[PDB]
Amino acid sequence: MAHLLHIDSSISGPASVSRPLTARAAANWKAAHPDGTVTYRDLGASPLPHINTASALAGVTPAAERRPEQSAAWAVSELVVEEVREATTIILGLPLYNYGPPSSVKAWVDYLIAPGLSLDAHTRAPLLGRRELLVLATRGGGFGPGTPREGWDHAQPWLPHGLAMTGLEPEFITTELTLAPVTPGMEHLVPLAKESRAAAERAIDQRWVT
Amino acid sequence: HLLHIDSSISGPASVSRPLTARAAANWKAAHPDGTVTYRDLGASPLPHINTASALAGVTPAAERRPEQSAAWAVSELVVEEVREATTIILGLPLYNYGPPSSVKAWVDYLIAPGLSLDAHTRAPLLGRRELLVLATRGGGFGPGTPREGWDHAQPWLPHGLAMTGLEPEFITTELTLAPVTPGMEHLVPLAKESRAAAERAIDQR
Numbered sequence: 001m002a003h004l005l006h007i008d009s010s011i012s013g014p015a016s017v018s019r020p021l022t023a024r025a026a027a028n029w030k031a032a033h034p035d036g037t038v039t040y041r042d043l044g045a046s047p048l049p050h051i052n053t054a055s056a057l058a059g060v061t062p063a064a065e066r067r068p069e070q071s072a073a074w075a076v077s078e079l080v081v082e083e084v085r086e087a088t089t090i091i092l093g094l095p096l097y098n099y100g101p102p103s104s105v106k107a108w109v110d111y112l113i114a115p116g117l118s119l120d121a122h123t124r125a126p127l128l129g130r131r132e133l134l135v136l137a138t139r140g141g142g143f144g145p146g147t148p149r150e151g152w153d154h155a156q157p158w159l160p161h162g163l164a165m166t167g168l169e170p171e172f173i174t175t176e177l178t179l180a181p182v183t184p185g186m187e188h189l190v191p192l193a194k195e196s197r198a199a200a201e202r203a204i205d206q207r208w209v210t
Numbered sequence: 211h212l213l214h215i216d217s218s219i220s221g222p223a224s225v226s227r228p229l230t231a232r233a234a235a236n237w238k239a240a241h242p243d244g245t246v247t248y249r250d251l252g253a254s255p256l257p258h259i260n261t262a263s264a265l266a267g268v269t270p271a272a273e274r275r276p277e278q279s280a281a282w283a284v285s286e287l288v289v290e291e292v293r294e295a296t297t298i299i300l301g302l303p304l305y306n307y308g309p310p311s312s313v314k315a316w317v318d319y320l321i322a323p324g325l326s327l328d329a330h331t332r333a334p335l336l337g338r339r340e341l342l343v344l345a346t347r348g349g350g351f352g353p354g355t356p357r358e359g360w361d362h363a364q365p366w367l368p369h370g371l372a373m374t375g376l377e378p379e380f381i382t383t384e385l386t387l388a389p390v391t392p393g394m395e396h397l398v399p400l401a402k403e404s405r406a407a408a409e410r411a412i413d414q415r
């Protein structure tokens with residue numbers, strides 16, 4: 001049955017570009033899926049803690065012989081995988097911070113890669129396939145082909161490789177040049193920033209409709 | 211002075227921790243009477259920057275939220291450790307085709323206007339330092355290999371640090387899973403090749 005996992009990872013608060021875009025997508029989804037319920041996760045406000053030496057390798061250690069930190073980490077993996085298993089659609093906000101994904105999203109994927117939960121512990125067959133993963137990526141500069149920052153995005157090409165074991169295949173709507181309006185010497189690029197946002201908003205408005 | 215940074219979560223199984231303690235020893239040889247600051251991001255990671263604690267550098271010191279002041283204190287202490295150093299030794303494992311989340315957060319704290327770069331000119335303030343990065347991959351990411359372009363740790367770090375003026379130099383140990391992983395037993399030669407060629411490059415420095 002139709003179920004939305006709405007994940008935010010922006011740390012910008014009221015200045016966030018990704019939060020309005022994921023709220024827009026989520027309301028567009030709820031209207032296209034009128035019996036659909038929604039689970040919300042804000043990794044921005046409430047990040048999941050880093051996997052540490054004490055809590056790592058829960059997936060290879062049997063339950064009976066885990067340290068109390070590994071069992072805590074395993075409980076976190078059971079929760080984040082369950083949320084994705086229940087979903088037919090996942091909407092993730094993905095800012096580019098220091099030319100990579102938010103640390104919170106990297107740890108969220110660390111928890112999601114869990115043998116027997118997200119992939120078969122024996123066949124290694126993906127267990128979270130046949131699901132929609134819509135990723136609303138925001139970035140401060142321009143990273144398109146024939147820009148000077150081409151190849152500086154290590155979030156957008158990473159996420160499909162980080163998730164590729166689970167059968168989740170992210171589909172990207174990218175808004176760029178979002179630093180242009182707050183950045184001296186980017187005043188010629190403010191029209192492009194507005195156009196990039198409007199194009200993303202169009203793609204979000206036409207999603208799930210004929 | 212040397213900053214020795216570990217980010218392994220693999221404990222006694224770690225390939226990177228021995229390689230970094232090797233560098234620390236070879237450095238304490240070539241630079242005797244030098245001090246060492248040790249950082250274990252693996253055991254004791256710096257917490258994620260959150261909505262409450264973010265944007266400390268672009269918010270005036272007076273009108274900062276209490277948690278932004280906490281994050282700024284962490285940034286001051288992190289940048290200090292790199293400023294005090296002449297050589298930086300960092301262990302960079304590849305976990306889920308990226309860096310450890312611990313290292314991504316560590317770089318987030320390090321990118322701080324007025325500490326690692328001038329708040330106004332944005333001129334790098336941590337340049338003219340040695341940054342040696344002992345990268346450890348489980349698989350093989352070389353030209354033609356099926357996982358070519360799946361490393362989002364090594365090609366990322368120079369881009370993430372570029373505002374500070376640190377330029378990482380990589381010694382890459384790959385295929386470290388080959389000898390403990392069935393179906394990759396035909397790559398244990400290259401695994402032993404990689405680790406010794408890496409300990410070789412560590413020795414000649």
Ligand SMILES: Cc1cc2nc3c(=O)[nH]c(=O)nc-3n(C[C@H](O)[C@H](O)[C@H](O)COP(=O)(O)O)c2cc1C
Nearest residue numbers: 010012016017018095097098099138139140141178
């Ligand atoms: C801590 C931080 C680091 C950033 N690093 C980069 C960067 O490396 N490259 C870039 O193009 N923009 C960078 N930006 C700009 C963001 O990518 C941009 O504001 C984007 O809209 C973030 O999404 P959000 O508005 O939902 O937080 C950074 C912003 C912050 C707050």
Ligand SMILES: Cc1cc2nc3c(=O)[nH]c(=O)nc-3n(C[C@H](O)[C@H](O)[C@H](O)COP(=O)(O)O)c2cc1C
Nearest residue numbers: 218220224225226303304305306307346347348349
């Ligand atoms: C949680 C985890 C995830 C890993 N993900 C990858 C991966 O995406 N690609 C890969 O080639 N090896 C992967 N490996 C293998 C490690 O990169 C390899 O073990 C390396 O030695 C890590 O350094 P360390 O032993 O110091 O922790 C992973 C290992 C762990 C524990």
